[PDB]
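Case study B.
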Amino acid sequence: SSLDEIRQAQRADGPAGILAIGTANPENHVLQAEYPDYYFRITNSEHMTDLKEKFKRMCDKSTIRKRHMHLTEEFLKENPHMCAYMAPSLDTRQDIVVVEVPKLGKEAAVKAIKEWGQPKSKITHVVFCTTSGVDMPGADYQLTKLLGLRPSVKRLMMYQQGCFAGGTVLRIAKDLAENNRGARVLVVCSEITAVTFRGPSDTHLDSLVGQALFSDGAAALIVGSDPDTSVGEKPIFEMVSAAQTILPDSDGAIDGHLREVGLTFHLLKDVPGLISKNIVKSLDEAFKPLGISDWNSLFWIAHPGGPAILDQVEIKLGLKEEKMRATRHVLSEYGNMSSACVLFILDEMRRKSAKDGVATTGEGLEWGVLFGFGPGLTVETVVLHSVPL
Amino acid sequence: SLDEIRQAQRADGPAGILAIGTANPENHVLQAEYPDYYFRITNSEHMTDLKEKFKRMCDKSTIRKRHMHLTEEFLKENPHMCAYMAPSLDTRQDIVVVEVPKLGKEAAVKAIKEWGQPKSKITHVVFCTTSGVDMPGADYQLTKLLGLRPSVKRLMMYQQGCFAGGTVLRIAKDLAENNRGARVLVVCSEITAVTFRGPSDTHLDSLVGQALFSDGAAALIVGSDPDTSVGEKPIFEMVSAAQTILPDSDGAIDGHLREVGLTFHLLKDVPGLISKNIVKSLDEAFKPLGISDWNSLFWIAHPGGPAILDQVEIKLGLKEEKMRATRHVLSEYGNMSSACVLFILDEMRRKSAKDGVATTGEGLEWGVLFGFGPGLTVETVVLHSVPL
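Model:
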């Protein structure tokens, strides 16, 4: 009867858990070892011989083996304005991603829902995240339609977020699931680089780096509190806390602008140095309350923005080489899929843990940490607890 | 244990709106004079029949005044924004990526002043706009402009549309309620520089937008567990928040961000769809509370246009007084997209106080707030007033 009684009945009891993870990528893919030849040919830039050598080194240094790409050679042959460095091309790019981003998201969501094993009518909330296009109604609406979810799902559409937003969607889903009894949140991160693909320029090596790193993928979660074992729900990881911060002295480190030429990418500061110099503050804030100070005792998920971030964090903290294994495996096999990456890494970790026969979904360890890194410079820090295997 | 940590981490009570601040560009247009101004500045004075259509649209809009960042002087310098369809996204973005967080800041400063607490106590920022996109977003820019703590937890809601005043309340509710001590700065800021364009006699739906849309920002502080010992006091308390898609409404309102800016497209019958279905949202929200008399509620409805309000009133048998606050904001400010319903909350609690009625909700206990927009999406927030 009272507002207090209503509130306590309305909310969930326990911590939010990740109940299922599904992933998808465009079938079309490129091997990184072959990409410099392909890229300079399809962008009619073969005369740029010095720049091509720089791009070969970028691709070699990336540690990426394979990237999935919705954009095909045949499509680009028909759309040379997307192969130029800077031609009017937003409309064409939007035409692609407003359709393909929810479609790829749906593919991942179907897999998550299959693992979860529950009727889709039990989904109460949808969180859709992309950095690839914008439209109204949004991709959240399109996903809802494609999946045939209840019209009364509570949707949140996260557009133009950037690379930290795999952490952001966990932070969002945590509060939705924990504050609402029975809530089951479908989380989808879906990224298609048709908005950022463009030809090379030797006066914009930061843009060129993006053409070596960024790739396509989608990941989906079901998140909820108070799992129902009787119907086959089983958490994989439990969330404990989620934080976000802006690093000091990082203004303009990573900017992205949506323009008539598509989405442009700018780097102005040493991103690996900024992250490695400041990450301990985020670890202490997250783990000091738990009495944890040994960062090698945690299972690790880090957004693989590039290999230098991972290498410099590993050195700065004295991490064992094994700690970044799952992260690096995803970077190698998929490249930088922006917001989706950390969710692929959670999937990799729990799957490898099961294959290897260790004690928990987090490489046999109890506590873990997930980091998103992106424009701001923003760091998202999520504290996770594993589940026994 | 994790369960113990969870109990300590979360808040106890319902989320309240602790402060409301609003702002608009100083520049404004009187609706009575807009058809002449608009058809002049868009080089369309020869379009005689179309101007008459636009005059009737403006006359029927019930809008008296709209605030507009875009000035005549600026538009004279930028004829490509005055065309119906010319490449102009870059110019529009250049405006709104700066001006949207600036206007938001003006509203937020007022909300923070009313709240009366140190800005360091803000833990979360929710920024909502339909006017431009950028990385980092307007949430980051606002955080910087206000000098908030670098570790505020931000959510950037871009390209949301007209229902999102309801959406930000729904978001802020869960943030505040699930996090002990959380104090959420909510800002909706809209500038129509992305949608302004010249007329076309084959796109009368676009022309409607030119009669209705306007600029403004609103800011809230939202939190649970108000501390009276430092002078916090809720204005309204949130009880539940829902969202739904109306049946048979696919494609009613679409909006695309293109090289020509943001374009809007209307199909079907939006006032009809909303009014035919709104009772199902009211029943879902209020049947668990034992409430069925919709005239017993205080009302906030997104004033997407006058026909929505008129047809909801007729369908539900609402007394003429119910939509007073809503219509006042529509008259004085026009359709400020996501910010409107927050202006209407402010209008309602201020009028209530000035009139000396018993509560912030026109003397009534229970209320409802509706956002309407692309989907067709309806957001439904149940509110409880506070005694005056």
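The domain at 236-389 of chain A is CATH 3.40.47.10 (Peroxisomal Thiolase; Chain A, domain 1). The remaining cases will be described in the next quarterly update.
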